[PDB]
Amino acid sequence: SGPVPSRARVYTDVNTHRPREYWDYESHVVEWGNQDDYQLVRKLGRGKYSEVFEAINITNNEKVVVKILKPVKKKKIKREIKILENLRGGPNIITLADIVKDPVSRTPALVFEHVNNTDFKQLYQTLTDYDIRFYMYEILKALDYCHSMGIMHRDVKPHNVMIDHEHRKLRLIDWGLAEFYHPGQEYNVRVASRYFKGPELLVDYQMYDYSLDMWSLGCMLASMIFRKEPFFHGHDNYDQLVRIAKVLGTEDLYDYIDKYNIELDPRFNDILGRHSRKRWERFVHSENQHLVSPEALDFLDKLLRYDHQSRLTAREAMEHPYFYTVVKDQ
Ligand SMILES: O=S(=O)(c1ccc2ncsc2c1)N1CCC(CCNCc2ccc(-c3ccccc3)c(Cl)c2)CC1
Ligand code: NA
C-alpha cells in the first residue's frame, strides 16, 4: 500500500524547466541594502514570525513597510526572499523593495512598497456583490501568476490580502509559507491557519500542489458571501475535518481517501460519523442574500472539493460565470 502519488494538473514542470537557481533557494545569496536609509515611524502589527512597521526611506522620502523578522532558519528567510524576487512585478503581488540587517543585533528586515489598507470594519459593511466578485478576480490573477511561476502560496486567507478600496487595489502578502512546486515532492502538512487548511493537509497527504490555494480561496469566498467568518470553525485539526465533512458529506471524503489510498489516523474513525452533503441554501439568510447567487454557489462548489485534482485551477476559476460582469468591465 502506501498513498497513491499525485501531480499538479497544470504548471506541473515549470520549475524543472527553469535554471536550478530559480527554485534552489538554499543557494541564494541575499542582496543587502543599507539599514540607515530607513527610519521607523510607527508599529502596524505583530505576527507569528515578525513585527511590522511603517517607515520612511530618508533617501527619497517614500513611505515603506518594514517587516522585522523574529528568529527563523536562514533557509526559510532565503525561501521567502527568492519567492518575492521571482514574483516581483506580477499582478497584485506585494513588491519587495529592499532587505536590510541591523549590524549590531543582526536582525533581518524586509522592506515593502506601502499599500494603504482599508480598515476591516469599514470594508466589511460596504462590500457589494460586485465588489466581492471584483476582488476575488484580483486574488485569482495573483494566484494564477504565482502558480504559473511554480509557487504555491499555502497561506491564503483574509489577513494575507490587503485591499486599498479607494484605489480598487489588492495585494497578496506574506509569502513566508510559500513553496516551490516540484512533481513528486512531499510537503509539510503543518501549514496554513486551521480554518483554511485543505482536506489534504488534515488527512496528512503530503504530495499536494497549487490546488491547496484554491481550497483556501473557496473558504474565503464562503465566509464573505455567507457573512460567516470563519466558515469552517474547527476546534482542532481533527475537528476541522469533521466541520468540513458535515457540509461536503462523508461519502465523498471516504471516496477521496480510497482513491489516494490514504491511511486515516485511528482517532478520526470515531469522530467523522456519517453526514449527508448539505445544500448551500442552508447558509443563506435575509442579511447575506444580496451576496449569494446561483453563480456564486456553482463557483464555490467547484473550489471546495476533497479531491485536490477536481478543484478549479485559478485560470478556470477566472472563466467562471460568477466573473462575467467583472471581465466585461475590465
Ligand atoms: O498593517 S499590516 O500588518 C501590514 C501593512 C502593509 C504591509 N505590506 C506588506 S506586509 C504588510 C503588513 N496589515 C496586516 C494584514 C492586514 C490584512 C487586511 N485584510 C483585509 C481583507 C482582505 C480580504 C477580504 C476579502 C475576502 C473575500 C473576498 C473579498 C475580500 C477582506 Cl473582507 C478583508 C492589513 C494590515
Ligand atoms: Na506532486
Short mmCIF file of C-alpha atoms and ligand atoms in Angstrom, two decimals:
data_model
loop_
_atom_site.label_atom_id
_atom_site.label_comp_id
_atom_site.label_asym_id
_atom_site.label_seq_id
_atom_site.Cartn_x
_atom_site.Cartn_y
_atom_site.Cartn_z
CA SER A 1 0.00 0.00 0.00
CA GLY A 2 1.26 3.48 0.96
CA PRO A 3 -0.51 6.50 -0.65
CA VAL A 4 -1.07 6.89 -4.40
CA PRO A 5 1.16 9.66 -5.87
CA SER A 6 -0.19 12.89 -7.33
CA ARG A 7 0.91 15.59 -9.80
CA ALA A 8 -0.48 19.09 -10.42
CA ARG A 9 -2.85 19.10 -13.42
CA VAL A 10 -1.32 22.40 -14.53
CA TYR A 11 2.08 24.08 -14.39
CA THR A 12 3.46 20.65 -13.47
CA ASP A 13 7.04 21.05 -14.69
CA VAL A 14 7.51 24.83 -14.69
CA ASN A 15 10.39 24.63 -12.17
CA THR A 16 12.02 21.64 -13.87
CA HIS A 17 12.41 23.85 -16.99
CA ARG A 18 13.94 26.81 -15.04
CA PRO A 19 17.60 27.11 -14.11
CA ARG A 20 18.17 25.46 -10.69
CA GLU A 21 18.96 28.80 -9.09
CA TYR A 22 15.28 29.86 -9.64
CA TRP A 23 13.98 27.37 -7.06
CA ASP A 24 17.11 26.24 -5.20
CA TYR A 25 16.73 28.94 -2.55
CA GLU A 26 19.20 27.27 -0.14
CA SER A 27 21.95 28.52 -2.52
CA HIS A 28 20.56 32.07 -2.77
CA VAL A 29 22.88 34.95 -1.75
CA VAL A 30 20.88 37.80 -0.23
CA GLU A 31 21.47 41.31 -1.63
CA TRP A 32 21.60 43.64 1.44
CA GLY A 33 20.65 47.29 1.31
CA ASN A 34 21.61 50.00 3.80
CA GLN A 35 19.60 49.92 7.06
CA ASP A 36 20.36 53.59 7.65
CA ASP A 37 18.21 54.51 4.68
CA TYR A 38 15.03 53.79 6.73
CA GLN A 39 13.61 55.38 9.86
CA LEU A 40 10.76 53.59 11.67
CA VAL A 41 7.60 55.72 12.12
CA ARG A 42 5.05 53.51 13.94
CA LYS A 43 4.18 49.94 14.68
CA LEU A 44 1.44 48.45 12.44
CA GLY A 45 1.10 44.97 13.92
CA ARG A 46 2.83 41.75 15.14
CA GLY A 47 2.70 38.21 13.61
CA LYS A 48 3.99 34.70 14.45
CA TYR A 49 7.34 35.44 12.70
CA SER A 50 7.62 39.29 12.58
CA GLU A 51 6.84 42.84 13.76
CA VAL A 52 5.58 45.23 11.06
CA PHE A 53 6.27 48.99 10.96
CA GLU A 54 5.54 51.98 8.82
CA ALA A 55 8.84 53.62 7.92
CA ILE A 56 10.27 56.30 5.68
CA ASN A 57 13.12 55.96 3.21
CA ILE A 58 15.09 59.13 4.05
CA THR A 59 16.95 58.95 0.67
CA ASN A 60 13.75 59.74 -1.27
CA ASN A 61 11.10 60.41 1.49
CA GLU A 62 8.95 57.43 0.34
CA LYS A 63 6.64 55.63 2.83
CA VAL A 64 7.56 51.92 3.07
CA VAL A 65 6.64 48.97 5.29
CA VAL A 66 9.37 47.14 7.27
CA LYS A 67 8.85 43.57 8.44
CA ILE A 68 11.48 42.83 11.11
CA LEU A 69 11.89 39.02 11.30
CA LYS A 70 11.69 37.08 14.57
CA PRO A 71 14.36 34.28 14.68
CA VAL A 72 13.87 31.78 11.79
CA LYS A 73 16.25 29.38 10.00
CA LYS A 74 18.30 31.18 7.25
CA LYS A 75 16.85 28.86 4.58
CA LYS A 76 13.24 29.96 5.37
CA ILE A 77 14.25 33.65 5.02
CA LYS A 78 16.07 32.80 1.76
CA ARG A 79 12.94 30.99 0.52
CA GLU A 80 10.65 33.98 1.15
CA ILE A 81 13.16 36.42 -0.42
CA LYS A 82 13.67 34.24 -3.50
CA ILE A 83 9.92 33.81 -4.00
CA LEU A 84 9.27 37.56 -3.59
CA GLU A 85 12.05 38.33 -6.09
CA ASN A 86 10.79 35.71 -8.58
CA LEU A 87 7.22 37.10 -8.36
CA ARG A 88 8.17 40.82 -8.30
CA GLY A 89 6.15 42.75 -10.90
CA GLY A 90 3.42 40.09 -11.06
CA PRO A 91 -0.25 41.08 -10.84
CA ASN A 92 -1.27 42.01 -7.31
CA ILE A 93 1.92 40.59 -5.76
CA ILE A 94 3.38 42.69 -2.90
CA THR A 95 6.62 44.37 -4.04
CA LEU A 96 9.75 43.67 -2.03
CA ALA A 97 11.74 46.94 -2.22
CA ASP A 98 14.83 46.09 -0.09
CA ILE A 99 16.36 43.80 2.50
CA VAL A 100 18.38 45.17 5.45
CA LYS A 101 20.16 43.90 8.55
CA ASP A 102 20.68 45.68 11.85
CA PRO A 103 24.53 45.41 12.07
CA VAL A 104 24.52 45.08 15.91
CA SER A 105 21.64 42.59 16.64
CA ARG A 106 21.96 41.04 13.17
CA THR A 107 18.10 41.02 12.85
CA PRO A 108 16.96 40.92 9.14
CA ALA A 109 14.16 43.19 7.90
CA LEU A 110 12.21 43.02 4.62
CA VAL A 111 11.19 46.38 3.14
CA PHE A 112 7.99 46.56 1.08
CA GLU A 113 6.08 49.02 -1.08
CA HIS A 114 3.45 50.87 1.06
CA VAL A 115 -0.21 49.89 0.47
CA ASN A 116 -2.92 51.98 2.20
CA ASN A 117 -5.16 49.09 3.55
CA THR A 118 -8.86 49.87 4.31
CA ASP A 119 -9.97 49.15 7.87
CA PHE A 120 -11.76 45.78 8.08
CA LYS A 121 -14.81 47.07 9.98
CA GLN A 122 -15.45 49.71 7.26
CA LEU A 123 -14.78 47.36 4.30
CA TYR A 124 -17.00 44.56 5.63
CA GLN A 125 -20.22 46.54 5.76
CA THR A 126 -19.81 48.36 2.42
CA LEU A 127 -18.77 45.43 0.17
CA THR A 128 -21.33 44.74 -2.56
CA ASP A 129 -21.84 41.55 -4.59
CA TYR A 130 -19.89 43.28 -7.40
CA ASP A 131 -17.04 44.21 -5.07
CA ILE A 132 -16.64 40.59 -3.89
CA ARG A 133 -16.53 39.30 -7.47
CA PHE A 134 -14.02 42.04 -8.41
CA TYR A 135 -11.63 41.44 -5.51
CA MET A 136 -11.93 37.62 -5.88
CA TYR A 137 -10.90 38.06 -9.57
CA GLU A 138 -7.91 40.21 -8.45
CA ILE A 139 -6.82 37.45 -5.98
CA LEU A 140 -7.16 34.87 -8.79
CA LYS A 141 -4.83 36.93 -11.00
CA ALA A 142 -2.15 36.77 -8.25
CA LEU A 143 -2.69 33.01 -7.72
CA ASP A 144 -2.64 32.15 -11.45
CA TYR A 145 0.54 34.19 -11.71
CA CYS A 146 2.36 32.60 -8.77
CA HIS A 147 1.19 29.09 -9.74
CA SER A 148 2.38 29.72 -13.32
CA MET A 149 5.74 30.75 -11.77
CA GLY A 150 5.96 27.41 -9.93
CA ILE A 151 4.97 28.72 -6.45
CA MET A 152 2.19 27.73 -4.02
CA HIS A 153 1.24 30.49 -1.53
CA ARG A 154 -0.03 27.95 1.07
CA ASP A 155 -1.47 30.60 3.40
CA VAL A 156 -4.36 32.23 1.52
CA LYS A 157 -6.72 33.94 3.98
CA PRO A 158 -8.13 37.45 4.64
CA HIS A 159 -5.15 38.52 6.79
CA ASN A 160 -2.87 37.92 3.79
CA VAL A 161 -4.99 40.03 1.38
CA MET A 162 -4.58 43.78 1.50
CA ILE A 163 -7.28 45.97 -0.12
CA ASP A 164 -6.88 49.70 -0.74
CA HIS A 165 -10.58 50.20 -1.52
CA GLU A 166 -10.25 53.88 -2.62
CA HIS A 167 -7.83 52.81 -5.34
CA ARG A 168 -9.56 49.45 -6.08
CA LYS A 169 -6.14 47.93 -5.37
CA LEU A 170 -5.42 44.46 -3.97
CA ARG A 171 -2.18 42.81 -2.88
CA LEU A 172 -1.42 39.22 -1.83
CA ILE A 173 1.08 39.42 1.07
CA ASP A 174 3.03 37.20 3.50
CA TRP A 175 4.91 34.81 1.26
CA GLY A 176 6.71 33.36 4.33
CA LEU A 177 4.91 29.99 3.99
CA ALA A 178 5.08 29.77 0.17
CA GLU A 179 6.99 26.92 -1.50
CA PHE A 180 8.14 25.87 -4.98
CA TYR A 181 6.10 23.04 -6.59
CA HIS A 182 8.15 20.05 -7.75
CA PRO A 183 6.42 16.89 -9.05
CA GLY A 184 6.89 14.07 -6.54
CA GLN A 185 7.80 16.31 -3.59
CA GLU A 186 6.32 15.55 -0.16
CA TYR A 187 5.47 18.82 1.62
CA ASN A 188 4.90 19.69 5.26
CA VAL A 189 1.17 19.45 6.05
CA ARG A 190 1.62 21.74 9.12
CA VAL A 191 0.94 24.92 7.13
CA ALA A 192 -1.90 27.44 6.91
CA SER A 193 -4.36 28.52 9.55
CA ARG A 194 -6.72 25.77 10.81
CA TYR A 195 -9.85 27.28 9.26
CA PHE A 196 -8.25 27.43 5.78
CA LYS A 197 -6.47 24.07 5.71
CA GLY A 198 -7.33 21.78 2.80
CA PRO A 199 -8.51 18.20 3.45
CA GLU A 200 -5.15 17.01 2.05
CA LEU A 201 -3.37 18.69 4.96
CA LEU A 202 -5.86 17.39 7.55
CA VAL A 203 -5.53 13.74 6.39
CA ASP A 204 -1.68 14.07 6.08
CA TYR A 205 -1.45 13.68 2.26
CA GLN A 206 1.92 15.27 1.58
CA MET A 207 2.11 15.19 -2.26
CA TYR A 208 -0.11 18.26 -2.66
CA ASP A 209 0.17 21.17 -5.12
CA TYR A 210 -1.16 24.62 -6.17
CA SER A 211 -4.72 23.31 -5.71
CA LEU A 212 -4.30 23.76 -1.92
CA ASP A 213 -4.58 27.52 -2.51
CA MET A 214 -7.89 27.00 -4.36
CA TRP A 215 -9.44 25.29 -1.31
CA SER A 216 -8.29 28.20 0.89
CA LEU A 217 -9.77 30.65 -1.61
CA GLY A 218 -13.10 28.77 -1.53
CA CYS A 219 -13.08 29.07 2.28
CA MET A 220 -12.60 32.84 1.93
CA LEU A 221 -15.41 33.11 -0.63
CA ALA A 222 -17.82 31.15 1.61
CA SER A 223 -17.02 33.38 4.60
CA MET A 224 -17.65 36.55 2.52
CA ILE A 225 -20.90 35.59 0.65
CA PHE A 226 -22.43 33.94 3.73
CA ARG A 227 -21.16 36.51 6.29
CA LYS A 228 -19.71 33.73 8.43
CA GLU A 229 -16.09 34.17 9.46
CA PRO A 230 -14.63 31.61 9.83
CA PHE A 231 -16.81 29.38 7.65
CA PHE A 232 -15.42 26.02 8.81
CA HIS A 233 -14.76 26.62 12.53
CA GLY A 234 -12.89 23.58 13.85
CA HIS A 235 -11.71 23.23 17.45
CA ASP A 236 -8.50 21.48 16.37
CA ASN A 237 -7.14 19.83 13.20
CA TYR A 238 -9.27 16.70 13.68
CA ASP A 239 -12.50 18.59 14.36
CA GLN A 240 -11.63 20.82 11.37
CA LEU A 241 -12.12 17.84 9.04
CA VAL A 242 -15.36 16.99 10.91
CA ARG A 243 -16.69 20.50 10.26
CA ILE A 244 -15.88 20.12 6.55
CA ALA A 245 -17.49 16.64 6.47
CA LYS A 246 -20.73 17.99 7.98
CA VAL A 247 -21.04 20.21 4.87
CA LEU A 248 -19.38 18.33 1.97
CA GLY A 249 -20.57 14.97 3.36
CA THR A 250 -18.67 11.85 4.38
CA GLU A 251 -19.42 9.79 1.20
CA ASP A 252 -17.11 11.98 -0.96
CA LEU A 253 -14.49 12.10 1.83
CA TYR A 254 -14.22 8.31 2.02
CA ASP A 255 -14.18 8.17 -1.83
CA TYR A 256 -11.13 10.58 -1.77
CA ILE A 257 -9.34 8.56 0.92
CA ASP A 258 -9.96 5.36 -1.07
CA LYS A 259 -8.74 6.88 -4.36
CA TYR A 260 -5.41 8.00 -2.87
CA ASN A 261 -5.07 5.00 -0.50
CA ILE A 262 -4.75 7.40 2.41
CA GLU A 263 -4.32 5.81 5.86
CA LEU A 264 -6.61 7.70 8.18
CA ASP A 265 -5.46 8.20 11.77
CA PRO A 266 -7.39 5.81 14.14
CA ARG A 267 -8.73 8.85 16.10
CA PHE A 268 -10.70 10.10 13.06
CA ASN A 269 -12.73 6.87 12.66
CA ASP A 270 -14.69 7.64 15.85
CA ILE A 271 -15.44 11.31 15.17
CA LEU A 272 -16.20 11.57 11.38
CA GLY A 273 -19.51 9.70 11.62
CA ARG A 274 -21.93 9.78 8.67
CA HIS A 275 -23.00 13.08 7.10
CA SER A 276 -25.06 13.97 4.06
CA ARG A 277 -23.75 16.55 1.59
CA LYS A 278 -25.63 19.76 2.52
CA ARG A 279 -27.17 22.22 0.13
CA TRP A 280 -25.62 25.71 0.22
CA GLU A 281 -29.13 27.10 0.73
CA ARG A 282 -28.93 26.43 4.48
CA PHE A 283 -26.33 29.27 4.89
CA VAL A 284 -28.47 31.86 3.00
CA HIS A 285 -30.49 34.38 5.04
CA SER A 286 -32.02 37.88 4.61
CA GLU A 287 -28.71 39.57 5.73
CA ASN A 288 -26.42 37.80 3.19
CA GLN A 289 -28.80 37.06 0.31
CA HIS A 290 -27.64 40.07 -1.72
CA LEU A 291 -24.17 38.41 -1.93
CA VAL A 292 -25.39 34.93 -2.90
CA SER A 293 -26.29 33.90 -6.48
CA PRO A 294 -26.55 30.63 -8.40
CA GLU A 295 -23.25 31.65 -9.98
CA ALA A 296 -21.57 32.18 -6.61
CA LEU A 297 -22.76 28.78 -5.34
CA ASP A 298 -21.72 26.96 -8.54
CA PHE A 299 -18.25 28.54 -8.31
CA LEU A 300 -17.91 27.79 -4.58
CA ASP A 301 -18.98 24.15 -5.16
CA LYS A 302 -16.17 23.78 -7.74
CA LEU A 303 -13.47 25.10 -5.35
CA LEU A 304 -14.49 23.18 -2.21
CA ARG A 305 -13.75 19.56 -3.32
CA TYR A 306 -11.90 16.99 -1.15
CA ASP A 307 -10.07 15.72 -4.23
CA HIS A 308 -7.46 18.41 -4.94
CA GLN A 309 -7.34 17.21 -8.60
CA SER A 310 -11.04 18.08 -9.16
CA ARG A 311 -10.86 21.71 -7.87
CA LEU A 312 -10.87 24.52 -10.42
CA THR A 313 -7.49 25.89 -11.40
CA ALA A 314 -7.00 29.63 -10.94
CA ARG A 315 -7.32 30.18 -14.70
CA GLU A 316 -10.51 28.03 -14.91
CA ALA A 317 -11.98 29.93 -11.93
CA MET A 318 -11.39 33.24 -13.75
CA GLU A 319 -13.51 31.93 -16.68
CA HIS A 320 -16.48 31.08 -14.42
CA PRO A 321 -19.82 32.91 -14.99
CA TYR A 322 -19.52 34.46 -11.49
CA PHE A 323 -16.95 36.85 -13.04
CA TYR A 324 -18.64 37.64 -16.41
CA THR A 325 -19.62 41.23 -15.39
CA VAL A 326 -16.13 41.93 -13.94
CA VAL A 327 -14.40 40.62 -17.10
CA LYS A 328 -16.65 42.74 -19.34
CA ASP A 329 -15.98 45.92 -17.30
CA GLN A 330 -12.18 45.48 -17.45
O1 LIG B 1 -0.63 46.66 8.82
S1 LIG B 1 -0.23 45.35 8.43
O2 LIG B 1 0.41 44.48 9.37
C1 LIG B 1 0.77 45.48 7.01
C2 LIG B 1 0.65 46.60 6.19
C3 LIG B 1 1.30 46.63 4.96
C4 LIG B 1 2.08 45.54 4.56
N1 LIG B 1 2.77 45.42 3.35
C5 LIG B 1 3.35 44.26 3.28
S2 LIG B 1 3.13 43.19 4.64
C6 LIG B 1 2.17 44.42 5.40
C7 LIG B 1 1.53 44.38 6.63
N2 LIG B 1 -1.58 44.57 7.92
C8 LIG B 1 -1.90 43.23 8.46
C9 LIG B 1 -2.66 42.43 7.41
C10 LIG B 1 -3.96 43.17 7.15
C11 LIG B 1 -4.95 42.34 6.34
C12 LIG B 1 -6.09 43.10 5.67
N3 LIG B 1 -7.28 42.23 5.42
C13 LIG B 1 -8.31 42.90 4.58
C14 LIG B 1 -9.24 41.96 3.86
C15 LIG B 1 -8.77 41.15 2.83
C16 LIG B 1 -9.63 40.39 2.06
C17 LIG B 1 -11.01 40.42 2.29
C18 LIG B 1 -11.88 39.73 1.29
C19 LIG B 1 -12.25 38.39 1.45
C20 LIG B 1 -13.00 37.74 0.48
C21 LIG B 1 -13.40 38.41 -0.66
C22 LIG B 1 -13.04 39.73 -0.84
C23 LIG B 1 -12.29 40.39 0.12
C24 LIG B 1 -11.47 41.24 3.34
CL1 LIG B 1 -13.16 41.33 3.75
C25 LIG B 1 -10.61 41.99 4.10
C26 LIG B 1 -3.62 44.53 6.54
C27 LIG B 1 -2.77 45.34 7.52
NA NA B 2 3.37 16.22 -6.92
#
